[PDB]
Amino acid sequence: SMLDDAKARLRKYDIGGKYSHLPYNKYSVLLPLVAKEGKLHLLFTVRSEKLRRAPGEVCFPGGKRDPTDMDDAATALREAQEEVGLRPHQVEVVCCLVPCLIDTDTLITPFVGLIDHNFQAQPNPAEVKDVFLVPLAYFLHPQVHDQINHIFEYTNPEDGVTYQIKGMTANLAVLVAFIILEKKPT
Ligand SMILES: Cc1ccc(CNC[C@H](C)O)s1
């Protein structure tokens, strides 16, 4: 099936806990995969203006590890619940992708999760201004604008609203699309 095929592809790129003990400032993100109308989509947030990190930017749900978290996957799930109301029984964490090194002292660990079909986002307005889906296939033929810095523009055909996706967020979206969608019969 579509969902079983995605999980089998994803598992081949799982690095697991290999880099998780290194002595960095630690953050985790959840890359949430949602199936709608027979296709896979990724879920994104727009951060609220009043945050420290990335005010007003398009990002995946996530945040800083705290002492309560059993592991890096726990960080991602805790933060996703706080930001958009995703509960743990509504997510299957499938793998841990290559981590992102930034600022010389920080490591960001990305996890891919499959999201239950009955989940409906409840945006927490203290953290998130908006929550939206993009079809995964978009990232194979994106609409690119150069600011050189490459920026993707996505317009939701439901409402005509345009979103700008860039940086590590855009890079991770492309990676997930390549993993799941490359070399597929039609
Ligand atoms: C927890 C976070 C660390 C940095 C962030 C900014 N958005 C980038 C993310 C890869 O979508 S959020």
UniProtKB/Swiss-Prot annotation:
Disulfide bonds: none annotated. GO terms for biological process: acetyl-CoA catabolic process; brown fat cell differentiation; butyryl-CoA catabolic process; coenzyme A catabolic process; malonyl-CoA catabolic process; medium-chain fatty-acyl-CoA catabolic process; nucleoside diphosphate metabolic process; propionyl-CoA catabolic process. Its EC number is 3.6.1.-, 3.6.1.77. It is an enzyme of class 3 (hydrolase). One of its GO terms (cellular component) is cytosol. Keywords: Hydrolase, Magnesium, Manganese, Metal-binding, Peroxisome, RNA-binding. The modification N6-succinyllysine is found at residue 7. It comes from the Eukaryota. The record marks 53 as: Important for coenzyme A binding. Residues 24-149 form the Nudix hydrolase domain. The keyword Cell membrane does not apply. Inhibited by fluoride. Mg(2+) binds at residues 79, 83. A motif (Nudix box) lies at residues 64-85. Its cofactor is Mn(2+); Mg(2+). One of its GO terms (molecular function) is snoRNA binding. It is found in: Peroxisome. Fatty acyl-coenzyme A (CoA) diphosphatase that hydrolyzes fatty acyl-CoA to yield acyl-4'-phosphopantetheine and adenosine 3',5'-bisphosphate. Cleaves CoA, CoA esters and oxidized CoA with similar efficiencies. Preferentially hydrolyzes medium-chain acyl-CoAs and bile acid-CoAs. Has no activity toward NDP-sugars, CDP-alcohols, (deoxy)nucleoside 5'-triphosphates, nucleoside 5'-di or monophosphates, diadenosine polyphosphates, NAD, NADH, NADP, NADPH or thymidine-5'-monophospho-p-nitrophenyl ester. Monomer. This is Peroxisomal coenzyme A diphosphatase NUDT7. The chain holds residues 14 to 209 of 238 of the full protein.
